[PDB]
Write a protein that binds this DNA or RNA. Sequence first.
DNA 1: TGAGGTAGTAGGTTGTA
DNA 2: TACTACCTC
DNA 3: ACAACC
Length: 692
Amino acid sequence: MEAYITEMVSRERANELEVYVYVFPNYEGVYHIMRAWQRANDLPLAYNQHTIMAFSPVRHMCGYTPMETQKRHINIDSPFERALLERLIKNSLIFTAERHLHAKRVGHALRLNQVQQIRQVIIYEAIELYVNIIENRISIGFHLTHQFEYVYTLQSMIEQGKTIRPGMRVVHSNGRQHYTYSTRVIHVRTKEQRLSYAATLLKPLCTFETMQPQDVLNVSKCIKLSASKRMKCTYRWIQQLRAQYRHLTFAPNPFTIAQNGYKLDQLSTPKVHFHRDYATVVSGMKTGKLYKGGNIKISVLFDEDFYLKHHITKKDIYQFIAVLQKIAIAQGVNMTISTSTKSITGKFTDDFFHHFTEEVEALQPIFAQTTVLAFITSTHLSNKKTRSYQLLKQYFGGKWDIASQVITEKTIEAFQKILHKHGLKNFYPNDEQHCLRVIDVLKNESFYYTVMNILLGVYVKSGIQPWILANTTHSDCFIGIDVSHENGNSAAGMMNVIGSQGHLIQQAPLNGILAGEKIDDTLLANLLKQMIKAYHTQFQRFPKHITIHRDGFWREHTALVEKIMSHYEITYDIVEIIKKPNRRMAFFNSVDNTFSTRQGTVYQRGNEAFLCATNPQQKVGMAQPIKIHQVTKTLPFSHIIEDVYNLSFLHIHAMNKMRLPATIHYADLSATAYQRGQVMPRSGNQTNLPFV
DNA sequence: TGAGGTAGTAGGTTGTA
DNA sequence: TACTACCTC
DNA sequence: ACAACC
Ligand SMILES: [Mn+2]
Ligand SMILES: [Mn+2]
Ligand SMILES: [Mn+2]
C-alpha cells in the first residue's frame, strides 16, 4: 500500500527557468499595465509591485515603455522574485486550464463541470491550485471541492406568480467575482450604498440556510464522498491538465510521498489511566472508576413548558436525575440534590423567560455553591425575544461564576421513548431494583453516549478529572493560545496543562478581554509566570521543558519568551498547529484500486508535518489532516508530533474523540466564551472547564 | 443547547526587497 | 472568523 | 492588488 499526497514536485529547479523581466518607474503598481498587456497579447503574465514577469516575449505593448528589459533567471535569495515566479506559474496553469479544459475562474477556484441536478440546484466541481517554492524546488498542491447555484433568475420569480421580499439575499456573478446583497427595477444594497440592476442578472443565493427541506438531504449526499471517489476525481483531472502543460515536467506517478520528499511514520494509540491502564477511553468509562472522584451538589432548574407545551412532569425529571445518580457512585462520584430549590416552586413560567433580565438576581442565594441543571425548552433558548441560553450563560458565568448544564426537551423525549419501547414506567425515584433495570436496558442503546456526555460535562464543570494518560510525555508543561474575532472585538483563550500525563487540565486565571488583536508583552509574561508558578505549586519543583501550542501562525514576540524562560533556566518550544491545510492523505491499495486512511499517520519533511487524527465513516466524509510546524530547535520534531497526537486523547468533556489536541480545542472554546461574556476568572488548583 | 465528525456558504484582517 | 446542513456514538 | 490564514 503506497502512501499518496495531493501534491507534486517538478523536475526543473527554480533557477533553471528562463523568464523575461520588465521594470517600470502603493501595492497596486502596474496592475493596469498587466491587464492591458494580457488583453492585447494573449499570454500568461504576472506582476509584483512594479515588475512584470512572463515566459514569452511581449510584442504588443500598447504604447508602454519600461525602464529595463532583461531575459535572465530567478535569484533564489530574493523572496520578491520567488513570489513573482510563483504567481506566474499559477497564472500559466490557470491559463492552460481555461483554454484546454473549458474551466471558468469563478470565485477563488476553477469551476469545471456540473455533476448533479438536484431539483433546480446545480452542484459543480471546483479545484484550488497552490504553488510554492521550497529550497529551489517548485511544488504544486491542489484541492477539490464543490459549488452551488440555482437554475432560475429573479426574472423567473417576476413571472409565473409570487414576489420577492425586500430583504431577500441575491448574488450577481460577473464571472470572476460575485457580490451578495417585465424587467422591473431592483434596489439591492451590499452596504449603505445604493445599487440597481435589470433583475435579469441577479440570482438567489444558494446556502444551506436558504435551501428548502427535502433538498438539503440530497445535496448533502453529493458533497460527502468516499475517499476513493474524491482522490480519483482529483487525480484524473490533474493528469488531464498535466497532459497539456509544457513549462514544467513531472514524473509519471508524481503523487506518491517518495516523489515529494516526505517520510512515513505510524503512531499508536496511547493508554489511559482511570484506576488501572485501559486500552480505550470508552471501555474505561463503561467499566471503570474515575481518576479523581469527589462530591457534587446539584440544583434543578425546571420550567413549566415541559408540562404545558409537552407531556413531561417534574417527577419524570427527578427520576431521570435519579438514573443519572445511579450511573454515578458506581464510578466513584457522589451527587446530592440541593434542597434549597424548594421555595421557588412554579417560578419558571413564560413570563419569567420574557422578563428574565428583571426577574433575575433573586436566584443567586439558592443556586450558590452548586452546579445548575437547566431544563429549558428549545424554543425559549432559541427565540430572539427570549434568548434563554445567552442570558442564562451570561448571568451565571460572568456575574456569579456558577456552572450550569443545559438539557432540552428532545433529550427527555428520547429517554421516555426508550422507556415506552421497553415498557418500563415504574417509580424510578426513591425506589431501587428499577433504576438498575433501566441502566441495564440503557447499556444496549445509543442513548448511553448521550447520558455519559451529560455526566462528563457535569464532572468537568464540578472539578472531577475522569482520566489521565497512562504513559509520560516528552514535555512537562503545555500552553494553548488562541484569539477570537467578533464584531470588531477580540478575546484570548489561554489554557494550562500541568504534568506530563495531564494531571491537571485548567485555564489561566487571567482576563481574556483585549483591545485589538495584539497579545501584549505584559499578558504573555503573566501567562508564562503563572504557568511556572502553578507547576511549582503542583509538583514542588520547577519544570524542565515547556511547550507552547499556537492556533494559527505565531505572531507574538519570540524574544520575550526566551528572556522570561532563560531567567528560570527552563527550556521551551513553540509549535504552530494549522487546521484546514487544504491537503489530503490516503493509502492506495492496488489489489482493489481503492483509497483508505489510517489514524495516526505522519508525513514529515523538514520542520513541517501532516498528521491524521480521525477515522470518520464512509457517509461522514474524509479525514482532515493537521499541519504541524516547529519554530524552535530544542526538541526532536518526532517527539513534538508524538506529544501533539497524544494530547488529543484527553477529551475529558465527552466520550467522542476530538481531532485537535486538548490545548487548542479548549483554548478556542475559552476565547469564544470570553467573547460572549459567559465566563469569569476563578483561582484554584482543580480541573476547571466551565465552557466544556 | 448530549457530544464529536466533515463539507458547503459569506466576510475580515495581515503582510508583501 | 462566523454560520448552516447532514451522520455517528 | 494577491496571498494566506482566519
Ligand atoms: Mn485561530
Ligand atoms: Mn478558534
Ligand atoms: Mn457543553
